[PDB]
Structure formats: structure tokens, C-alpha cells
Symmetry: C5
Subunit: 271 residues, 5 copies
């Protein structure tokens, strides 16, 4: 896309506000354990590594329809919505201030219930087209067939424990692409901005912040934000805050929702 000047005047700016609920594995809001995974299980061997249905976190994603940019398609320029900035927050951080749930507990069954703790994984992306994904896994043989709604490659190969550029996808479905085997494709995504962090280990303290005062600038080094193809804005995320440890030591992922407030402006482009 050859980017030209900003469009000025009335109705040249718009905002989009949304939230995305977490997709930890139990993704039905009408059922118990919503916002958690099913109980984690562990393979006996790498050739019998078959996660149960619902124990696998996936990306959250939505396409938002922007205000229509009505115009003649036969002229030498067109208009696109350009995402300038986003204010985004993890919602419900305070819910982790809870140590009376039915959990394993400290100090000879007299202390606190274990809080949700351990692995944290936080990412978000805002773009003008679906987030482009690269397949990469810790175990090429993982069998995802317990849940046919998970979108994964139809063939397995040893090389997918590294980067094999023949294994790619686009994030086009909520609650379906496992984070364990799909990551952003850094060779593409020119029209998306993504930001991610991982803090691993076993029982690691979650470290989280929340504020309504932080603006993330989405403009690139040339001053250009994501350009929304077909007036579609794509928002994606995952926010794992740790594991809930049940009385018997069984564990489930816990995720939290994410909020977004995105500012967009009209940008002229060559046609």
C-alpha cells in the first residue's frame, strides 16, 4: 500500500471499544469453570501426547466492522481507516486476591489456599487484517484430535520443532488456534502491531498491572499505523495469569479478559 496524506475535517477520527473474554479451554460462559482450562494432563511419552479436549489455551480474536468509507473505486486514491493508538488493559486483576477457594493450601492445612500462580503469558495485537501465524511446537507429534475444533496443520513433521516456513496460518477464528503451536509470523505482519511476554516456571508469582492512563502508539517508524482492509479492524490476545491448584494437586490454566480502546483516523492511499 502506497500511503498518502491524512484526511482532515469532520468525522475523520473514530474510536472502537471492545473486550475479549479469555479462551483457556472451558470457553462456554454458561458452564462451570468458565475462564479456566480443563484439568491439565501429562503425556506418558512424546509419541502419545494427546491433550484432552479443553485443556489447551487458544488465542482470543475479533474482527470489528468500522464505519463505512463510501467512495468511488475508480479514482487514483482511496481512503482507509488507520489505527493510531490503543489503550488496552487486563480486566479483573483484583480477582487474583483470593486465597479461600477450594485449593491446595499452605502450612499443614492451616494456611492460605494457594493463589492462582505460575506461568504468565500476555500478548495483544491490533492490525488491519488477520494476525499472520507461524507454526512452531515443542513436540512435533502432539495429537490434537481430541478436539477437532482446534485449527492445526493436517500433517506433522520433525522440522516443526524449529521454524519451517511451509507451516503458516492466519488467526481467523476465536478460541481455536492453540498458543502452544502458533506464534506471530515475524516475516509477515507488516500491517499489524503485536506485543507479547512470557514468564515461565512452576509456581512463579504473577506480576500484573492495570491502569486507564497508558496509550500505546501503533504508528510505525514512518508514522503509519495499521491500515484496515475492507474496513475491518482485527484485535487478538491471550492473557494467562497462572494455574489454579486444586486440593489434590490437579491444575488448570486461568485467564483474564482484555479491554481495548482504539483510536483510528482516515488515511488517503494510492489506488
Amino acid at each position: 500500500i502506497e500511503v498518502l496524506n491524512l484526511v482532515t475535517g469532520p468525522d475523520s477520527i473514530t474510536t472502537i471499544e471492545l473486550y475479549l473474554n479469555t479462551r483457556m479451554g472451558q470457553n462456554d460462559e454458561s458452564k462451570d469453570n468458565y475462564g479456566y482450562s480443563e484439568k491439565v494432563t501429562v503425556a506418558n511419552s512424546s509419541d502419545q501426547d494427546k491433550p484432552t479436549s479443553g485443556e489447551i489455551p487458544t488465542y482470543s480474536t475479533a474482527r470489528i466492522n468500522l464505519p463505512m468509507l463510501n467512495e468511488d473505486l475508480t479514482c487514483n486514491t482511496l481512503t482507509m481507516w488507520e489505527a493510531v493508538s490503543v489503550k488496552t488493559e487486563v480486566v479483573g486483576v483484583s480477582s487474583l486476591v483470593n486465597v479461600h477457594m477450594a485449593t491446595k493450601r499452605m502450612y499443614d492445612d492451616k494456611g492460605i489456599g494457594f493463589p492462582v500462580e505460575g506461568m504468565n503469558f500476555h500478548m495483544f495485537a491490533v492490525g488491519g487484517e488477520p494476525l499472520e501465524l507461524q507454526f512452531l511446537t515443542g513436540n512435533y507429534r502432539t495429537d490434537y484430535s481430541a478436539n477437532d475444533k482446534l485449527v492445526v496443520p493436517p500433517i506433522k513433521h520433525q522440522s516443526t520443532q524449529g521454524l519451517n516456513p511451509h507451516y503458516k496460518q492466519k488467526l481467523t477464528k476465536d478460541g481455536a488456534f492453540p498458543v502452544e503451536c502458533w506464534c506471530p509470523d515475524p516475516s509477515k505482519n507488516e500491517n499489524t502491531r503485536y506485543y507479547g511476554s512470557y514468564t515461565g516456571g512452576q509456581s512463579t508469582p504473577p506480576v500484573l498491572q492495570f491502569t486507564n492512563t497508558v496509550t500505546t502508539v501503533l504508528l510505525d517508524e514512518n508514522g503509519v499505523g495499521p491500515l484496515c482492509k475492507g474496513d475491518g479492524l482485527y484485535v487478538s490476545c491471550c492473557d494467562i495469569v497462572g494455574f489454579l491448584v486444586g486440593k489434590d494437586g490437579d491444575m488448570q490454566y486461568r485467564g483474564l479478559p482484555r479491554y481495548f480502546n482504539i483510536l483510528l483516523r482516515k488515511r488517503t492511499v494510492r489506488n
Copy 2:
């Protein structure tokens, strides 16, 4: 509110100083264990998760009266107090330098008493109206009926383990809204600034700072601070610094007070 010019000269500025004491669960300054929760207990099962009275932390909040501005509410323009900045500190951090309290001890009963340690949760908000809340919980079935002075929703539903926008509130009462199930609503709070952090885990070192040299600017991206509706200033916080571990392993939340020094200025608005 349509914001017009600043009012200048003498009497155009005022400052508000206050502190808020912690609301950990034992919230009566005339009783033992003030500034701590009652002993934490642990649910036998998720459908029998009923915290005892006084074991759960709540938000601290106050509405402060500001000097009356408008004798005549039918003038074409009116004046409002605009909060410009705040200096805020957690008070009594040094009280955590104490390892001789009646606590569990290190090294086969020869070493130090355990200091207050573990989960930290710190947040404050300054606004021109009550802080707007969103309900979100780790357990939709939590039963708050041991303490009818708490403010919680009248109905429970599975979806409240994620973000359900039908479950909202406003922080209108000190020591009554549980931290564990209410968080700031990021879709509202246009007239409040809030800042929060959480560090979890079991016995995690508290990491705390105190200084009288830091000013937090409350002006938004347009140079406008919170506007105090009805000449009321709203201040809210929570500061959990960890758990006290009793000799038998029984644990209590410990909180600390927070100090605020808020600078406000007169702003003309259209009426």
C-alpha cells in the same frame, strides 16, 4: 461537560490532603487485629465456598467535600474543581521491619519470625465521581452471606468468571466492596484515573517504596483532569502488603494506609 478556560489568580487553586486506613477485614480501630483480616479459611469445594465474616479485603474510599463554587446554578457558565495532580504514598512501610511478632519461625524455631510476606496488591484512584466497577470473580459460586454488610450482586452466574457487562457497580461505600470480585470498569471511568498492581505467589518478598518527591499528573491527553461533579472529590485505594503467618500456620492479610495530597484548580465549563 464542555470544558472552557481556566480561572486564574488568587483563590483559583486548592489542595486536599487525606489518608485512608486499610480495610482488610478487621476494620474497627478499637479492636485487636485492626489493619489485618480475620484468619483465612479454605473452601471444602467450589459449591461450598463461603468466606467467614472479616476474612476478605475491601476497597477503601472517601468522598471529600470541596469549597462550593456556584451560588447560582442558572448562570450561562459554571465553575468546577479540576484535579491536576496527586502525591500519594503508602504509609508505615517500615512497620514490616519486624521479625519478633508471634509468628512461625525459620530454622527449627531458632531463627527469625516470618515477616509479613506474600501477595501484594496496590491500587489507587482519583476521580470527580465514584469509581465505576466491573464484577469478575475466580469462583461464580462464592457465597458472601456470612457478612451482609458487603456489597455484591444479588444473583450469581457462570459467566461472571469472565467479563459480563450486566454485572457492574459504583464504589460508594468504604470497607464494603470486596477486592476479589470487583475491579475498575475500563469501559467507563472517563472522569477517574486509576493505577494498580498485583504481585502474587505464596511467600513472595514484598517490594515497596516510599518517598515524598513523586507527583502523578492526573491530566488526560487533552490536558483535562477529573472534574469534580457536585464539588465532590473521590479517592479510592487498596494496599495489601502480604500475610502474617501465625505460629500454627494460620494466616491473615495485612494492609497499610495510603496518604494523598491532591492539587485542584478552577475550570470554567459551559452550562
Copy 3:
């Protein structure tokens, strides 16, 4: 104070250090720079620390050159913790790692670091984890004469000024944020049981003491007040007995002459 112009021409520096006040504060006695052995209350009602087991603030007043009126204004300070390298020591008579074959435990655990520079005594607020704490094992301490449950929170009826070195316990006195208009203070706490100390030292960092209006602390009666505490952890003896360990703090304070209205 009604502040007017700076005097040009007019600057001086003050250099000092403060030794640590961990509990055994006599420089000629064994265990100097450490507390006495920590003891643990049988119950909150019986909580009476032994003499010398609790850290206190270090403080001094420096007499400045005698001078509308002219006052000394503290502009900046270079401050650093002394002797950090002394913590590189794992052969002391301590508990040790790996089945009595590995290193002695280094000094580790709780860290608490604060300093203040002002033109008058640091103003303190009382706040304690246990209102019942009995300080009568050491009558050289300065604590309130009466006890009340409300002191586990902020009760503004319980205040003092930091006028005596090695006497105000850090466990029950903190900087009063509602006062101290003429002092700058800075503090940090890292807790837990055996936490690694994380410390830095350099002679290259200047801390500006000027407030948001460009005015530093103004030295009333030509007195400059410096206060601090630097707890770097616990020494763990062979049998598990523990003692606080503290280190000295150095200060180099730049002052200038300020005219004020009288």
C-alpha cells in the same frame, strides 16, 4: 518561609557518614553493626523485644556556617552505602549449604534502605504491626507512652520528630507524609525470608533535592538534618540464631545561599 532570590558569587558542601544502628550500636563492643539475636514472641500480648534486637534510625544534625535573611538551601546530595563488598563473605561461623560441605550462608533476607535530608528534624508517624509491643527492655528507645489498637493503622495523634540517633525503632516509626515539607526522603523495602540482597554503590550519582518549585530544604537555625537506615539482611548463625546486619551510609550535600523574607 517566603523564598526570594539566590545569592550569587555562596555555595558550600557538607560531607559525613552515619554508622548503622541495628541494635548493638557501641563501636567498641562485639557484634557492632548487627542486632542482638532475634527472639520471637510467644503471643502478641507477650511481645517484648530483647534489648538491642531492633534496628533504629541513624540521624545527625550538622551545624552550618552562621549567616530579609540568608539561609542555607540544600540543592543536591550524593549518597551511597559503604562496605557493600563486606557481604562477599561465606566463611563466617554460620549455617552452611549442602550437608555441611558448601558455603556458609551469606548475609541475606530483608533489605530496608532509606535516607532523608532536610532543614529540620525528620517528622515521624507512629505505625506498628502490633500495638501491644513492649519496648521496656530498653529505656533509651523513644516510643509513645500509651498504647492503642488504632496504632496498627494511621492514628495522627501519634507523631514525633527524629531528634536522637539509635533510639527511634524503624518497626514503629515511619516518615509522616502529611508534614516533611522541608525534608526530602526516599525509601525502599524488600522482604521475605532469605531473599537475595540487591545493592549498588557508585560515586557518580547526584540526587536533586529541589522541589517542584526549584526550592531545596531550607536550614532553619543553620542546622542540616541527615537520617537513614540500611538493613542488608540477616546473618544466620550455626544453630539458626539470626541477627540484622546494617551498613554505613555516606553523604555529600551541596548547599547554596538563599535570601528569604523576614
Copy 4:
């Protein structure tokens, strides 16, 4: 090189994009355990310290051919201005169902990949210059004759002995454990590295497509690509996979690079 002015006008900029797969020890993409090491073994004594073939991470490196500049007093070189680089597949570490040791008496999660992290990258106009330095001068590398190591051993190599140097000229061959960047050379390369050690330490990782690293030095001059060759090198260890019985393997991840270059005039 006598550095003169930047070349102006159209065609004066180019970009190079690539990725490098990790070299943890099993470096064959057709075989199981690709992107991990072979099982770690432990010496019985310092004079019997002979790592098995494939248990040793090595540097990843490539030389990239740039567009030819000079068909014939001054000449033109490509100058590397900046790089955007990221570790790929961080999300693959959100996996606790692999065949691993477990938490909480075989009821809890499988251990994630955790422990030692080592991350470095280098971009230069010639091979990365290396200094030998090892924890054990007696390490015997003879189980794998494809590893590039010095021809003799000496006690002094547990510190810095400047008689023990090399250049990073082969992918998957120079062990990380005994070769580091030579800080006395590398005038024409920029390198950045970090190490977080310990036993089971949480990995702390970030990934974004928004960060540009400037490669210009204090005089405004980036790496100058001798013979129209760009050199890229890295290593990204993200921890260990802990097998059911306690057996452990290094895990590494690939790294992506997008490098911006410009034409710079220099003297013949």
C-alpha cells in the same frame, strides 16, 4: 576503511530478511528432538569431562550475499543501519502436557521448559571475532569432530588468554560454552547478549514487531559489509526440558532478523 559520504538518491537502501534455526545439538530438521540438545550428561571428574555428541549448544550464523556494488578511487559498501530482531515461537513454551516430570506428586502440571536462558545476537560486515574462555580447560570435545575448538589445552583458558581466538565462520559448530565475542576486536560488528542462570529459573521472554535496534556507532557509522557480505549470528537458549526420570535437554528457539542497509562511499 576511510569512510566518506552516504550515497544519495534512488536505490540507495536495501533490506535483508532472514531467520536462523537454533543449534542446541540435535541440529537435523529431519530427526526427532530437533531444536533441543541430546540428553545432558555430567562428568565424573574434571579430567574426565567429555560431553556426548550433540549435548552442546553452538552458535547459529550465516553470511548473506548483498547486491553487488562495484563493477569497477572511491568505492561503495553496504552499511548496516539498524535491525529488527525477535525470538520466534515464544508461545510454544505455554505447554505443560509434554512427557515431563510433574508437579504435586504426579497430579499437577508437567514442568514447562525452564531454567538457564542465554540470548545473544550479532550483526556485522565480517565474521564475529571470538575469544576462547572455558569453565574447564580440560574439556574433551573429541566425541564430535565437527566442533571447532583450539588445537591445544591450557589452564590459562579458564581466564582470558589472547593466544586463543577464532572467527565465527560455521553454523552449528562453535560451542557457546567455550567461545564468546572478543571485545578487543569486533570493530565492524555489533553484538548484544544476556545470561540468566540458576537451576529451574523462570524464563522471561518478550516478542514484538515494533522495536528497532540502531547499529550505528558513536560516529554514526554502521557495520560495513566487506565483499558485499552481511554476517548474522545468534544463540537463544530458553531453558531445559525435564524428562519423566529427570533427564534434561537444552531447548532453543529460532531468531528472525530484518536488517536495513544503505550505500556508503569509502576510499579505494
Copy 5:
């Protein structure tokens, strides 16, 4: 109680010079020909504080060197003289990647099946650049420490309780490599007007080392008045210590491990009063 006249820079050709050097670590076994070089001898532990006598070679010392700079003044009676002024330093810890090694003969994880313990625990990193020897203050965790197993160490000739705090009667200058123990000597903050020093300590038992290395960072040595260390008698003084943890042997015996540090120092000619 409480309590060189610098003129202009010399401009033009030959007014700048650079000094490049490295210092090898002094952990206790400081003989580059012997096994255990770059490590201490095995750590031992006192039975009591009055019997705290470290073995020879178990304690780390400062590395240091004086570098001879080009001689500037053929006539020392001139009304002004020239001195080398240290403007900046690029410094790096060398060999960080050597810590990516878990097959050495060490204690190991997971019931003798897992990795050998990497070098881990206490980290101590400091460097100093100045125009005269680093000025030292004695301060110790134990005033009674007996250093007589190694008479090549430089320590005070008498002991006193007060040395567990700051006793300013116990000072020294860092004039010998591999001889001043870091456990009892630190920079004297009341002096060192003509040296810049930077240090950090991360303690604990088995703490992860957190280390960085790059050739892209310049540390400015100029003070607040724009003046760097001035090299008295044309000598540049460089000092450091870089402890990266302990190696844990099979039986639990432990040794300090240190790494070398590299320096590239830029200096310029400065005129001074005489």
C-alpha cells in the same frame, strides 16, 4: 567532625589517545598455570567467630593495574603542564557464555539424572577508572577474621570491634593486584575525587546470575563540571572484581568463579596550572 587547577583542553593532532586492556580475575587461585585458575580454592567455614581463619586461596581479591601513558612534560618547571584526562570507558565482562555449561563434575539435579548445577549464587561486579590508586576503606563482617594463612594479602596489622562499622583510621590504597580482599576493603567514599567507581552485589545462596555483554555501551567518566579523572604522573589506574557465582562440586564443596573484564578508555590532553 563534619566538613589540580584545571585549565583548557589541548586541541589538534595527537591530543587524544586510547588505552585497551583486560584484567583477569583474582578469585584465589591466581596462577594461570595451575588447575583451578579463575576460581577460588574450596570455601571453608569457621567453627566460631574467634576461629575464623580462611584458608590460603579461598578469598577473592581486587584486580588492578597501573597503565603507563605517553609522557607529556619534558620540563616540569613550566607555568602550566599537560595531563591525560580519562573521558569515557567501554567495559565488558568477558566469557559470559562459559556459564552455559552443565556437564562439569558438579552436584546435579533430579536424583542424579538431571543437569550439573551451573555456576550460580552470589554476584559481585565492580570497576573503577582513575588517575591515581583507588582509595579504600576497611569494613568487615567479622572484626576477628585472621588472614595469617596467606601473608601475601594486604590487611590491617591490628583488629578492633569498630571495623564492623566505618572506622576511618583503617584505610588503604589499591596498589597491588590479587592481594586486597574484597570482603574487607571497599571504596572510600570520602576520597576518590579523581576516580569513578561503579559496583553491584546480588547475594543469596543459589541465585541466578543475571549478566549482560555488549560492545555498544560507553560510560562517561566526566564529572558534573565536565572533568574526567586526571592521570597523575601519567598513570591510569583500572580496577575491578567480577564474581559470577559458585561452582558446586560433587560432594557439595564450593568455589568462587570469576570472569575477566575488558576496558577501552578514551583520554584527552588537559592543561593544568603549575
